[PDB]
């Protein structure tokens, strides 16, 4: 039989689906590698060689899996800066806390974080960088 087959680009679906799809046209060997991208973790942005590349049918194809670089941030909204610091280290956060504006309220009124641009439960980059506004 033929020992070479041209690979289609399976950039657009899930890596599993892409690997399965190529396997249907190939029966080749596949391996996956995750690279940082805005694409959510699991989506494949493609293969190293472009569509139309003839490869040996017994060779291995490398699927570039895009990792969003993001993780679901746990809940910690509505806290003070003095509560934040222990929480940040407990959470092992490496990034910077970007404080935008402070809202007039006062310690007596409880200077808590009121609004943050990236909410808890939303995916935040590996650096965990969140910009927020809290009481002054």
Domain identity same for 79 and 130: yes
Cα dihedral 4, 8, 10, 15, rounded to 10, equals -10
What is the Cα–Cα distance from 60 to 85, expressed in whole angstroms? 47
Residue pair 79/40 in contact by the 8 Å Cβ criterion = no
Instruction: Pick the last residue of a domain from 11, 46, 68.
Output: 68
For residue 4, give both structure tokens.
């070479």
Same domain, 19 and 47: yes
Tokens of 24: 């249907």
What's the CA gap between 69 and 38, in Å, rounded? 8
How far apart are the C-alpha atoms of 99 and 115, rounded to whole Å?
Answer: 11
Range of the domain at 115: 69-136
CA distances from 102 to 80, 81, 82, 98, 112 (A): 12, 11, 15, 11, 10
């Amino acid at each position: 039989g033929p020992a070479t087959k041209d690979i289609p680009d399976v950039a657009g679906q899930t890596v599993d689906v892409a690997q399965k799809n190529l396997n249907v046209y190939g029966f080749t060997k596949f391996s996956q590698a995750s690279v940082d991208s805005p694409r959510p973790a699991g989506e494949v942005t493609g293969t190293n060689p472009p569509a139309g590349t003839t490869v040996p049918v017994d060779s291995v194809i490398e699927l570039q899996v895009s990792k969003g670089n993001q993780f679901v941030m746990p809940d910690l909204s509505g806290m003070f800066w003095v509560d934040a610091e222990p929480r940040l280290r407990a959470l092992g956060w490496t990034g910077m806390l970007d404080k935008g504006a402070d809202v007039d309220a006062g310690g007596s009124q409880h200077n808590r974080v009121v609004y943050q641009n990236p909410p808890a439960g939303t995916g935040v980059n590996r650096d965990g960088i969140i910009t927020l506004r809290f009481g002054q």
